[PDB]
Amino acid sequence: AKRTKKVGITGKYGVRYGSSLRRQVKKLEIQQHARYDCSFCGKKTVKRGAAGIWTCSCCKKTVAGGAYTVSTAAAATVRSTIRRLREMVEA
Amino acid sequence: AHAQSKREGRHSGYGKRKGTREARLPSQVVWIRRLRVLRRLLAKYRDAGKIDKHLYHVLYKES
Amino acid sequence: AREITDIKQFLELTRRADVKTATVKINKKLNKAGKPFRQTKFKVRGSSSLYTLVINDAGKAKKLIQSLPPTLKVNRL
């Protein structure tokens, strides 16, 4: 029973702050609250709690991550070119 | 005396009502009342066999 | 602070070195459904805690009372 036409989680803020700041906030909220896959046991149980800290519901591994998302574009591109450079020094 | 006349359904009219229907008895309370009873009618029929476990499980998420 | 129910163990308290006092109590009490009976509690006063031994049956209770060491100082009721 589609509850709100477009303000999603951001509907708590009412009419305040102006559409555009809500638009922005809504994006990262949707990001930060949502449940992610665990690169360790496979169960989509990683949830946030304080920026950059991602922990696993069961299995209890805790990863450092983005302020509002688990992996951040930048970090992963760094992971990849760390691979790259390391490959150079066993090959 | 009064409390009797109450529980005989009296002085309960729109002119003796002052808090909202909601406040008098919460919507939610009703839901939990009702839903817990469906949920547990279900359980006895399964734990007995009047219902088969598959039919139960549809009724559960159906209730 | 304590309840006892081994009648043998009990007697060994009454003859335990530091035990100076001891008191018998008698309670009118009722049995099961109908009538009443006469319950009796044997309280030995230890240095550190008060042991007490219920004996419902008066029959046991009677004999038990002579058994009481003839140097122990018993308060009756």
Binding site: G52, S71, A75, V78, L85, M88 | - | -
Partner: protein, 252 residues
């Protein structure tokens, strides 16, 4: 006239750090024999929020090579490092996210964090959530290594300056609208007493060089000389230009 606000801040009264809750102070291992002739293993035993900080810290415990017991460090957690991970710190350590290696031992383009300005200063450069330096080459006599700092600046430091491979966790933090006063309120609540900010232009002349006048206005050029004296520097200090930065920046 009154002592203006930016002067007052310096005597640290109501103005010092709010520091009761902080996790300790993050730094790298002491530059001992192990870390500088080889490598030495630790485990990240937990990563944790540091109060009034952007990025998470990672408690990383090590063996004590000199007497039997454990010694634990407090690190700034690079992204991706996780509890239970083993951490390798040394010259002859290997090139994975989370380890810590002298800028000498990593190829150009490597991406490190918490890097030392001088060797064993236990870490100075790039620590804020998201930041990092990149090695952009090294001249192997007088073993320097040139890096590019998060500012754009390019410094050359010793090759034995340590750094930890990867980027600091918690990036993106600033992308999200604070939205209300309150959020910022609570933000500075765990930093210092710098918020809110009254505009000098709304004060009286006692109070500021911007104060007074029958309309609110700065009254003279607000770019102030480097040579200005205490009480004079409020505005755009030493500003070498001013106005809306048209056009792409990005240090050439």
């Amino acid at each position: 006239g009154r002592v203006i606000r930016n002067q007052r801040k310096g005597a640290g009264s109501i103005f010092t750090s709010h520091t009761r809750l902080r996790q300790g102070a993050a730094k790298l291992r002491t530059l001992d024999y192990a870390e500088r002739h080889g490598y030495i293993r630790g485990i990240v035993k937990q990563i944790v929020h540091d109060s009034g900080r952007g990025a998470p810290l990672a408690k990383v415990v090590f063996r004590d090579p000199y007497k039997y017991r454990l010694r634990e460090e407090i690190f700034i957690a690079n992204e991706g490092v996780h509890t239970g991970q083993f951490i390798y710190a040394g010259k002859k350590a290997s090139l994975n996210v989370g380890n810590v290696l002298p800028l000498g031992s990593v190829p150009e383009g490597t991406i490190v964090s918490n890097v030392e300005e001088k060797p064993g200063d236990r870490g100075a450069l790039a620590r804020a959530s998201g930041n990092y330096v990149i090695i952009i080459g090294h001249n192997p006599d007088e073993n320097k290594t040139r890096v590019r700092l998060p500012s754009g600046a390019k410094k050359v430091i010793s090759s034995d300056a340590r750094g930890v491979i990867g980027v600091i966790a918690g990036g993106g933090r600033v992308d999200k609208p604070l939205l209300k006063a309150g959020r910022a309120f609570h933000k500075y609540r765990l930093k210092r007493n710098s918020w809110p900010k009254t505009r000098g232009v709304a004060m009286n002349p006692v109070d500021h060089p911007h104060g007074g006048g029958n309309h609110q206005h700065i009254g003279k050029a607000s770019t102030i000389s480097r040579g200005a004296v205490s009480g004079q520097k409020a505005g755009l200090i030493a500003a070498r230009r001013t106005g809306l930065l048209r056009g792409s920046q990005k240090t050439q």
